[PDB]
Amino acid sequence: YTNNPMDLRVSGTGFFAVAKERLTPQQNELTRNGAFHLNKENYMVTANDEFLLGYQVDPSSGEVSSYEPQPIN
Amino acid sequence: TLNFGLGSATQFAAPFELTKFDEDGATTGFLTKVDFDENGSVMGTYSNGENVTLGRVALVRVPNEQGLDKKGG
């Protein structure tokens, strides 16, 4: 426990998805550490400045519309 | 030249009364006290009575604080 809100942990089964480049979410790798922080563009990135892949949820509906991965801003 | 503003002048049954008198004149004075408010403005009152605002205290924010290079001190 670090009490840092930007640190994340996957309890159970599943890996984080991180992309090498912002404009190519297809090229991604799986990880388990959660040392995340905002870069100069306000994107959540790892230690090596690899963008963290995320979904896009609807404004009102909690369910996520599209399942394609995109960088989290 | 003098500009007189009497926009609050009233005529009632009450006797003659000088409710408010304000001017913009000033005289030489010496720094008496200095205080800081919540906005960061450093205010100082002088012997004359003017509450001159010396300035504000700059605040700087960066999008990525983890990427700041560390100097000495």
C-alpha torsion sign, points B65, B67, B69, B73: positive
Cα–Cα distances in angstroms (integers) from residue B71 to residues A65, B68, in the given order: 46, 9
CA dihedral angle for residue A59, residue A61, residue A65, residue A67, rounded to 10 degrees: 100
Q: Which residues pair with A51 in a beta bridge?
A: A19, A45
Query: Smallest CA–CA separation between B65 and chain A, in Å?
Result: 8
- Resolution (angstroms) equals 3.4
Residue of B66, B68, B69 to mutate when probing chain A, most A C-beta within 10 A: B66
Test B63 with A37 for CB contact under 8 angstroms.
no
Task: Assess contact for A54 and A70: CB atoms under 8 A.
Answer: yes
CA A64 to chain centroid, in Å, comes to: 15
Residue for token pair 């800081």: B36
**Pairwise CA distance, residues B59 & A51, whole Å:** 29
